[PDB]
Structure 1
């Protein structure tokens, strides 16, 4: 594990998707320190820009190999490489919007390779996603637990709103290694994702994320 996942690792990401029928593609490059739980990425909208919806619904889809884990909590997703892992996610937003995500993670010629497919539907045309009225995610706590031969996570994830207030999603994700590796017991992951810069129309965006696991309560 420590031989192939080095203290510094780069990744490349491709996303294709649609939100309320608006199609797009994004290509990105990222890097970070998988054992310290820190990473950044630069994303570029190659098709469909500028996006007529909030960037914030896309930002959590761009890296679970970069979570700091205590020694006594098996780092299941690091153990999955070089083959890697896949995940499936549903975000149910409080005004009816739905985002579904599929993702494949692998290690190729020394870099992580991410392929993402995303479909967002049912967002009200006057709501904060399609009107671009969101202002970033609050810190999250993802509750992790093993179930049905995979690692499950659940989040009550909260976006800030431009004019005041907030906007929530109930998020559930299944993360599954491509080969049987040791599953952990139940634990929590503390996560903060920041947009560090962007051009005026969000067709070039930079992100930063810190994530650390720890024992429940």
Structure 2
């Protein structure tokens, strides 16, 4: 009784296009990714095409490179997958504890076996001797995103933690808004457990590979 949608194959690839500006530095990143949407497992190779090498931590960009690769159980409506073939948009604001702010905008369509993601990031007020600019980050902690529906949109908040060179953590608030381009069956209050890891990286992070697992769940208690 767990139902797949005919536009999303059990194995799909995607292409990501990303322009951005962080502390006034402009950069373009391109990426090819592949995974199993209904199993919530994905991987993507990223090439920095313009503005490399990047003067900030890679870890601030990693969470902007693929939402349809979430495992939804049979009793929870998959808002994102239901939106295809037309697609979805999302906007995101990331708030770090040293005062830095990022705004993100993403549009997503499909072209046969392939997802197209366009993504812009604008990041400002990054402490010049902070972990992001001194590249003292060491990958994300596994997160749980709270999600609910409001005005036919899907809101998501996530308290995240960048691991720091020399132990300790650098905190960040995620607030996500997902807008389907087509009326879909809205889900209730639910959670997405996520783990993102950077798997391979050359020395100047101009060529990076990362893998994500994304599982949607109910309350684990009751």
Matched, 1:20 2:23: yes
Q: Distance in 2 between matches of 1:38 and 1:110?
A: 16
Matched, 1:80 2:78: no
Offset from partner CA, 1:41-75 (integer Å, 9 cap, x none): 00000000000000000000001101000101000
Which residue does the alignment assign to 2:112?
A: 109
Contact kept? 1:88, 1:102, Cα under 8 Å: yes
Q: Number of matched residues?
A: 217
Matched, 1:152 2:155: yes
Matched, 1:181 2:194: no
Paired residue secondary structure (2:38): coil
Matched, 1:51 2:54: yes
TM-score by length of 2: 0.96
Give the C-alpha shift of residue 82 in structure 1: 0.7
Matched, 1:214 2:217: yes
Which residue does the alignment assign to 2:195?
A: 192
- Structure 2 residue runs without a partner (length 5+): none
- Structure 1 residue runs without a partner (length 5+): none
Match of 1:126 among 125, 129, 142: 129
Which residue does the alignment assign to 1:40?
A: 43
Matched, 1:60 2:89: no
Offset from partner CA, 1:86-141 (integer Å, 9 cap, x none): 10000000001111100011111331000000000000000000110000000000
Contact kept? 2:9, 2:113, Cα under 8 Å: no
Which residue does the alignment assign to 1:163?
A: 166
TM-score by length of 1: 0.98
Match of 1:29 among 29, 32, 49: 32
Contact kept? 2:199, 2:210, Cα under 8 Å: yes
